[PDB]
Amino acid sequence: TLWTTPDPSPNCTIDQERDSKLTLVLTKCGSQILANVSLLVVKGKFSNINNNTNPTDKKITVKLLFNEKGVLMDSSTLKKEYWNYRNDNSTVSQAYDNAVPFMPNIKAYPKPTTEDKKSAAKRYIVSNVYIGGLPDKTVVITIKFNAETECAYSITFEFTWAKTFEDVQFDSSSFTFSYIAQENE
Amino acid sequence: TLWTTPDPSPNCTIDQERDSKLTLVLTKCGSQILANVSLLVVKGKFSNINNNTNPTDKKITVKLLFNEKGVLMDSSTLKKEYWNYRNDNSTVSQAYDNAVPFMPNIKAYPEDKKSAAKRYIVSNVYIGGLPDKTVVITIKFNAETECAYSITFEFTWAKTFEDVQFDSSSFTFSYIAQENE
Amino acid sequence: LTLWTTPDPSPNCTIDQERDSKLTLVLTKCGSQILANVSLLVVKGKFSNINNNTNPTDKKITVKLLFNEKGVLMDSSTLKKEYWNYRNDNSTNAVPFMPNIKAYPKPTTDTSAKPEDKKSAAKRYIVSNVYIGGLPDKTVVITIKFNAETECAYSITFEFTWAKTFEDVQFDSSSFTFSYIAQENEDEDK
């Protein structure tokens, strides 16, 4: 298991710096990865969403980008702080993370470098997640795997709302999901 | 593995006593908890939902409250009896036993101000696995007083159902654990 | 404790035409629960450019996976047998990856009329929404019924359904995760 230790330490920079708290838990079920994501926006643009005085403010992306060794790159709007393995020994204080088996699968979700035949959607997840747990504030979570340039691997969260919000913090309800990938030989 | 035996023997007090049967499965892949929930109401208020006569009949909550030992309370709207390790051990009691690594994380669950929706899961289930009969399942982790931990199933619908047995499709979810033992 | 399609598989499904379509399903077995993940791409065929302006009734596609006593896949299935197993080659127990029969029993008209239903009608269903090339514009209902088919020991039955009248669309649905409950019962019953 490799996570954003389930405490707050702002660690993620959408509009302003340390902006926000994304709690993302990855847990390695052999072949498949089981993943949980809340996102809480402390300060910044999306601490007050208003689409009367900022209509366009209808979408936030937040990006994790990884190595050959699947370590988190700066070009990620997530900070390498408080992003490690937890084993019951204070491993998360260390940060020697070289965690390639937790990585979206190349064979499943390759880089999108385009007979005429290949899968647009295989590497998308798209559902709905709810602000404050309030069913009126319908938000479209979209998850993309290994879709970004400059990286071996790349998980992309991207929330999107059509209904115009009127002085709304971006707190999102948690979201469970799975992808695959590991070491190949 | 820690479950309400996948077969039906009623265990739930909505409206009437033993009203209905809840199917819930807690499997623990390490520090994360993968869970299944279906719900069939067999006698009473929800057994023939008619909102063309009894409108307010539009919501159903079912709570499980927990101890330091991770044990179910009398204050929980599901019955104690068959709640344990799956088949083999299922009779032998879970009491003296802790069940704390199945308990939702207590640290997990515009200022230093906290999250409102961190301890929510909010989506759609379907009565009959019919698209038309849209329900909205709302879970809420560790949000009940007078208890060490809490898991809280809320099922709402906007559509006025004419003669209908609440009979929820299976829904799948995770939540962060806490696995000292 | 993992059983799949290849993450990047060769056309492994007949829907419309022979070798029609390409189903990436991954079942991983977390103890007493099967974590699952399913994409569908349709390469050639009818559902490679669905055009609901010309064929209104083309608004469903069904993929069934009928199993054995021993959890082996069946000619009857719409998923071809060649590619399957976990990432080694012989073949198969394959049962411990099988939807539990007490939860999702085979549907028999031998059912008590005292209001104690052994299961619900829908307990075995899992109904939600996937999107065709992640474009939210294109809503797709996914529908998994468990053990719902006859002439088999155990079943899995992805049905895909769309309301909206597409034009020239190639059925390529977003990945969907779900769980079902596991059969794996220790033959020895104390």
Numbering used by the authors:
A (entry chain B): 187 to 300, 307 to 377
B (entry chain A): 187 to 295, 306 to 377
C (entry chain C): 186 to 277, 284 to 381
From the paper:
Each protein forms key interactions to promote cell infection, with the terminal domain of the fiber, the fiber knob protein, interacting with the viruses’ primary cell entry receptor. The adenovirus fiber knob protein is known to have a highly conserved trimeric structure. Sialic acid (SA) usage has been proposed as a cell infection mechanism for EKC causing HAdV-D. Here we highlight an important role for SA engagement by many HAdV-D. We provide apo state crystal structures of 7 previously undetermined HAdV-D fiber-knob proteins, and structures of HAdV-D25, D29, D30 and D53 fiber-knob proteins in complex with SA. Our findings demonstrate a conserved binding site for sialic acid, common across the species D adenoviruses, therefore suggesting that, along with CAR, the receptor can be used to initiate cell entry.
We performed X-ray crystallography to generate structures of species D human adenovirus fiber knob proteins HAdV-D15, D24, D29, D30, D32 and D53 in their apo states. HAdV-D15, D24 and D32 were crystallised in only their apo states, whereas HAdV-D25, D29, D30 and D53 crystals were also soaked with sialic acid. HAdV-D24 fiber knob crystals achieved only marginal resolution, and soaking rendered them too disordered for diffraction. Non-significant changes in transduction were observed when cells were transduced with viruses with the fiber-knob proteins of HAdV-D15, D24 and D29. CAR binding was investigated for fiber knob proteins of HAdV-D24, D26 and D32, and was found to be significantly weaker interacting. The respective IC50 values were quantified as 0.02931, 0.001261 and 0.01996 µg/10e5 cells. These values represent fold changes of 162, 6 and 110 times weaker compared with the IC50 value measured for HAdV-C5 fiber knob protein.
